Ligand binder design. Structure first.
Ligand SMILES: *[C@@H]1O[C@H](CO)[C@@H](O[C@@H]2O[C@H](CO)[C@@H](O)[C@H](O)[C@H]2NC(C)=O)[C@H](O)[C@H]1NC(C)=O
Ligand SMILES: *[C@@H]1O[C@H](CO)[C@@H](O[C@@H]2O[C@H](CO)[C@@H](O)[C@H](O)[C@H]2NC(C)=O)[C@H](O)[C@H]1NC(C)=O
Ligand SMILES: *[C@@H]1O[C@H](CO)[C@@H](O)[C@H](O)[C@H]1NC(C)=O
Ligand SMILES: *[C@@H]1O[C@H](CO)[C@@H](O)[C@H](O)[C@H]1NC(C)=O
Ligand SMILES: *[C@@H]1O[C@H](CO)[C@@H](O)[C@H](O)[C@H]1NC(C)=O
Ligand SMILES: *[C@@H]1O[C@H](CO)[C@@H](O)[C@H](O)[C@H]1NC(C)=O
Ligand SMILES: *[C@@H]1O[C@H](CO)[C@@H](O)[C@H](O)[C@H]1NC(C)=O
Ligand SMILES: *[C@@H]1O[C@H](CO)[C@@H](O)[C@H](O)[C@H]1NC(C)=O
Ligand SMILES: *[C@@H]1O[C@H](CO)[C@@H](O)[C@H](O)[C@H]1NC(C)=O
Ligand SMILES: *[C@@H]1O[C@H](CO)[C@@H](O)[C@H](O)[C@H]1NC(C)=O
Lengths: 415, 224, 346, 99, 49
């Protein structure tokens, strides 16, 4: 700590002590069924861009390491999460929207994106926590006449809201012609289909963009699974994997009135304080176990080499990862004495220490406030001195420190 | 119909999230009913609808308990997922279908594409029932609270904070909505829900205590 | 606003005014001396338990070493302030068996052995008025282990590395310092500030303190009962004000509130993203990749290090203010407790 | 007896030594030498890493200047006390007891 | 004759003028006017700058 080899006589702060976690527990809800991640990926065709289908997935094994080779794509455009540790999570629901777009607006499928096809057929929220899986469809969806099945809207009176579907057919009234149902001149309908070819250009070949909703840290969780559930312990420092939450705690039991819909609990600073067990509905508080720090009480290195150790503000029933106990904590390596000496090293709340021979030992004691006096007082009791002492007492005062001028360019950059 | 005007008072509060907090002062941005709003009665003997201004707050003081739905949609005639919350004495029948409802859908006491078919327990049973609905980010939510009322005059000073009942996975744009008739003589309330922010008080048990409309008074904005 | 009075002095060629009477008033001045001695671990606050956040915080060099050195200097400075304000005396004096201290009632300020602590009545009222936060000077971890009622604020402060170190001088020995100062002021007077205690009756000391303000010492020796009853009624007024009219302890309750709201703000800053995707660090390890995760962890480390540096800088400025007030309190104890001060409005 | 001035000298010396040692800190960059970064990196990515090192050493310099300003306020208070003691302990006799 | 109060006024005025002129600093971004960034960059690059 001192970054030296000689140590002066005093008390020195040292890095904290913590209790190592003993076991690791995993408590996942007992779900065993399977859901078609596969069958919605090698399908015959997908829905249109303006009529994108949203399907609900619940109560199945959440395996994301298998969609790598269920679909021939090239990596993930994940926002908020990552595909590497996606299988370690546990959340409420997943929705797989899918549509077939042109190639030069895969970059237009992003939160906070403005464009023609960003706001007229499909729009993302401002904070989208999901992944934007996309791959080509040069072999599966390509026709010599053209792909006239897919439709995209060119004209709308207002931009779309995020995650809302507008399926309709009508006649746009930008022009002044009152056709009111005729798709002739000057009131052209927005039902127009882009066409491709097998011998078409490569820069905007059609895609098969699939997004994932991934709502998390809310509600009971029912799309999880790919690990083994273990047992549970109480009042021991263990690691817990309650759904998605990870930490070290003792898992005490308390009396907190759960509403039937609530599945989490936070105290002040988004720190999780009570987790309902996914298997059985009960109480489980979360509390990381004992802590503090160590303070080294030593004389000089030239004087001795023995030390006295303080543990900060804790009953020392569990010392590791004689004994004198005070409100500042226990002391191992120090022996209490009932005397009162003018103390050298402050130790804690009310106690000091020194170095006395009575082999030399590191004693600790309650602080002497000076020698106790019983100074007399009556109606006739006065002390008048008959002699003095002209004493010279040296008082030392700083006046100025070193004048330092720092060259900002030379220090930061170095010519 | 007769539209009697009074104050909506401090009602329409729902749970913003399902995180159990105790003695926490929490504030958030949600679309719901502000404090001291207006009240439109609809007591009559007798179907025109109402515009959906991003939420409706409901209150029924029917001792006979005759209400079987709140129909939403765009043009209200079998166009965009006409919600029917028809309830019988055994279960609830919540479905979206297209049965070509034109005008005056009264239900006696004695089709196309239907995506939703879920059936749950009977939620409907000196009583007051609140059914705050909401549509945000393409999501549909249903709320319910069966607070036993004491005075059959108007909305009292009691607190009836709404717990989340059913969250839907699909939603459509809502513009026009009304209330279903129930005949063989009723009275209900409709409020308007404009975005302001909470200031929630949680007690020792975690139940939601009084809130503050921060965008209503300078005193309340000072409190927030 | 009224500026206070539309008074006019009655000046003339030779217009004078002299007072025919006095009022021995015990004006109460309340001064902070030491603040709460805190210490931040820089591993449980910023990182909690993660090895990755510790390894990225190792790249920042001697930031938290300087933070721990500054906080250790602050705590040692607070102990030095307490020692140089209270321990002006070398030997602890004791009360005589007779309590007739010249007719002045000192039972409210001299301690009594009825309570287990060696404190006094007015000191008990002053501790009961200031709602202390009950920080880590008492071992509250036994109370924080059991989840009684709801989760406490001090348990949330303690569990995030914001531990509170107890003072070296506890309340019993601080009350012993105060009782020794009171016994030396009554029995020895001002003469114990120049070496050892030199005994004096209290009427003589009050006479020789009237001589220091240009007043002859016949004033009390003709009116000892009146000055004694005025002192008794004034300290009774102080006692009744401490009992009912809680409008005087604003400085020290303010200091406790600054420390409590500073630790509460520094705790509540753990819920701020600072531009990251979330403020839960374990969900950041569980969700993200490697590289993107230490990117967001570096964003949280910069945000929490800026919050900690703001806390340490504000505590250094507040420690400068507290040290100025403690130098003022030490100058008062050296000058107007251990003697009599001739400075006007001091 | 001369612990205060030795403390002042050691405070300024260890402050300058800490500012010198802070040059070795990475601050999240790939290195800690400006010439090394400008030698191996490209233009834009070295601008990014140099901006990171500039932010780190600017925070270090701001901490150094703020700590020296607080210490200079303390030194100014002690120097005002020393000027007062030259004014009324040396240039006169002070009646302030325990002063 | 009155130098210290002139120093106080000049220090406050030059601190506020430095705070005003610090709007013109790029701080590593592409510009210093928020309207030009908000009308020149899409929301990801706009939120980065
Ligand atoms: C006051 O104290 C001084 C010493 O501090 C006394 O001086 C001593 O006097 C005796 C005989 O008079 C000598 O033998 C010693 O050598 C003196 N001491 C020193 C240090 O010079 C002085 O006498 C005392 N005053 C009275 C009145 O007794
Ligand atoms: C000087 O003022 C004091 C009060 O500040 C006077 O003391 C009071 O005198 C009245 C006379 O009627 C008594 O009723 C009170 O009980 C006294 N107060 C006490 C003893 O606390 C005093 O009389 C004044 N001096 C003169 C000469 O009038
Ligand atoms: C999960 O376990 C509980 C308790 O053993 C049981 O009641 C429940 O039916 C189980 N769920 C399933 C889907 O098997
Ligand atoms: C997807 O379905 C087609 C049609 O049955 C089938 O030929 C193909 O093998 C399937 N994909 C995989 C990976 O099995
Ligand atoms: C902690 O220490 C106190 C005081 O020594 C004691 O009263 C208490 O029982 C201890 N707690 C335990 C042993 O759990
Ligand atoms: C003063 O002397 C009287 C004489 O009887 C006595 O009663 C009283 O106690 C004395 N006061 C003190 C302080 O000794
Ligand atoms: C409610 O609305 C009516 C008309 O729509 C209006 O006359 C009345 O004042 C309103 N009540 C209020 C603002 O409290
Ligand atoms: C919390 O619930 C308990 C359950 O009996 C009740 O006794 C207590 O009064 C409640 N606390 C409140 C309402 O503040
Ligand atoms: C004294 O005051 C009177 C006012 O009555 C004034 O006339 C006179 O000039 C004053 N004395 C002197 C010396 O100015
Ligand atoms: C004043 O002193 C007497 C005895 O000297 C004592 O009985 C009384 O309680 C004292 N007054 C107060 C208010 O304590």
């Amino acid at each position: 700590t001192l970054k030296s080899f000689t140590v002066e006589k005093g008390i020195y702060q040292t890095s904290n002590f913590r209790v190592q976690p003993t076991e690791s527990i995993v408590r996942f809800p007992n779900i065993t069924n399977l859901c078609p991640f596969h069958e919605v990926f090698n399908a015959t065709t997908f829905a249109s861009v303006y009529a994108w289908n949203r399907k609900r997935i619940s109560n199945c094994v959440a395996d994301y390491s298998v969609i790598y080779n269920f679909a021939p794509f090239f990596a993930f455009k994940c926002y908020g999460v990552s595909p590497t540790k996606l299988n370690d999570l546990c959340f409420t629901n997943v929705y797989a929207d899918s549509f077939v777009i042109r190639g030069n607006e895969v970059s237009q499928i992003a939160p906070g994106q403005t464009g023609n096809i960003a706001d007229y057929n499909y729009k993302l929220p401002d904070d989208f926590t999901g992944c934007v899986i996309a791959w080509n469809s040069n072999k599966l969806d390509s026709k010599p006449s053209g792909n006239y099945n897919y439709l995209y809207r060119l004209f709308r009176k207002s931009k779309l809201k995020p995650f809302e579907r507008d399926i309709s057919t009508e006649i746009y009234q930008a022009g002044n012609k009152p056709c009111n149902g005729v798709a002739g001149p000057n009131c052209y309908s927005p039902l127009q289909s882009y066409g491709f070819r097998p011998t078409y250009g490569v820069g905007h070949q059609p895609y098969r963009v699939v997004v994932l909703s991934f709502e998390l840290l809310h509600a009971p969780a029912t799309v999880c699974g790919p690990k083994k559930s273990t047992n549970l312990v109480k009042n021991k420092c263990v690691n817990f994997n309650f759904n998605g939450l990870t930490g070290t705690g003792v898992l005490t039991e308390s009396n907190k009135k759960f509403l039937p819909f609530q599945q989490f609990g936070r105290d002040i600073a988004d720190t999780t304080d009570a987790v309902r067990d996914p298997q059985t509905l009960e109480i489980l508080d979360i509390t990381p176990c004992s802590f503090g720090g160590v303070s080294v009480i030593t004389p000089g290195t030239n004087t001795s080499n023995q030390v006295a150790v303080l543990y900060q503000g804790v009953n020392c029933t569990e010392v590791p990862v004689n004994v004198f106990q005070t409100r500042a904590g226990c002391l191992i390596g120090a022996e209490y004495v009932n005397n009162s000496y003018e103390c050298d090293i402050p130790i804690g709340a009310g106690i000091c220490a020194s170095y006395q021979t009575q082999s030399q030992s590191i004693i600790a004691y309650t602080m002497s406030l000076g020698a106790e006096n019983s100074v007399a007082y009556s109606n006739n009791s006065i002390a008048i001195p008959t002699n003095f002492t002209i004493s010279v007492t040296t008082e030392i005062l700083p006046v100025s420190m070193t004048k330092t001028s720092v060259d900002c360019t030379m220090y930061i950059c170095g010519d | 119909r007769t539209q009697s005007y009074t104050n909506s008072f401090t009602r329409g509060v729902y749970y913003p999230d399902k995180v159990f907090r105790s003695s926490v002062l929490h504030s958030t941005q949600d679309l719901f009913l502000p404090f001291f709003s207006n009240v439109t009665w609809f007591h009559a003997i007798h179907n025109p609808a109402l515009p959906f201004n991003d939420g409706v707050y409901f209150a029924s003081t029917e001792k006979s308990n005759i209400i079987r739905g709140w129909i939403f949609g765009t043009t209200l005639d079998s166009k965009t997922q006409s919600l029917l919350i028809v309830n019988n004495a055994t279960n609830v029948v919540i479905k979206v279908c297209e049965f070509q409802f034109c005008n005056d859908p009264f239900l006696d006491v004695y089709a196309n594409n239907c995506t939703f078919e879920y059936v749950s327990q009977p939620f409907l049973m000196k009583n007051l029932r609140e059914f705050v609905f909401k549509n945000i980010d393409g999501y549909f939510k249903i709320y319910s609270k069966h607070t036993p009322i004491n005075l059959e005059r108007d909305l009292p000073q009691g607190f009836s904070a709404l717990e989340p009942l059913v969250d839907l996975p699909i939603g459509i744009n809502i513009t026009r909505f009304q209330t279903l008739l129930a005949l063989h003589a009723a009275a209900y309330y409709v409020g308007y829900l404009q975005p302001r922010t909470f200031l929630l008080k949680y007690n020792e048990n975690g139940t939601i205590t009084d809130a503050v409309d921060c965008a209503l008074d300078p005193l309340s904005e000072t409190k927030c | 606003m009224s500026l206070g009075a539309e008074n006019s002095v009655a000046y003339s060629n030779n217009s004078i005014a002299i007072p025919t009477n006095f009022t021995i008033s015990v004006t109460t001045e309340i001064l902070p001396v030491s603040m709460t001695k805190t210490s931040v671990d820089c591993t449980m606050y910023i990182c909690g338990d993660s090895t990755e956040c510790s390894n990225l915080l190792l790249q920042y060099g001697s930031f938290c070493t300087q933070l721990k050195r500054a906080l250790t200097g602050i705590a040692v400075e607070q102990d030095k302030n307490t020692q140089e304000v209270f321990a002006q005396v070398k030997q602890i004096y004791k009360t005589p068996p007779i309590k007739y201290f010249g007719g002045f009632n000192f039972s409210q300020i001299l301690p009594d052995p009825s309570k287990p602590s060696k404190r006094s009545f007015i000191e008990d009222l002053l501790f009961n008025k200031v709602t202390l936060a009950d920080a880590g000077f008492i071992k509250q971890y036994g109370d924080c282990l059991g989840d009684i009622a709801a989760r406490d604020l001090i348990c949330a402060q303690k569990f995030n590395g914001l531990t509170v170190l107890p003072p070296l001088l506890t309340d019993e020995m601080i009350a012993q310092y105060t009782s020794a100062l009171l016994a030396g002021t009554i029995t020895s007077g001002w003469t114990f500030g120049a070496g050892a205690a030199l005994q004096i009756p209290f009427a003589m000391q009050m006479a020789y303190r009237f001589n220091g303000i240009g007043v002859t010492q016949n004033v009390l020796y003709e009116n000892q009962k009146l000055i004694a009853n005025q002192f008794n009624s004034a300290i009774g007024k102080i006692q009744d004000s401490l009992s009912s009219t809680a409008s005087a302890l604003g400085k020290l309750q303010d200091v406790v509130n600054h420390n409590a709201q500073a630790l509460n703000t520094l705790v509540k800053q753990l819920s701020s993203k600072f531009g990251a995707i979330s403020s839960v660090l374990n969900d950041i390890l569980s969700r993200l990749d490697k590289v993107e995760a230490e990117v967001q962890i570096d964003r949280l480390i910069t945000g929490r290090l800026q919050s900690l540096q703001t806390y340490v800088t504000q505590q250094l400025i507040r420690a400068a203010e507290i040290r100025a007030s403690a130098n003022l309190a030490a100058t008062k104890m050296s000058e107007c407790v251990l003697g009599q001060s001739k400075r006007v409005d001091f």
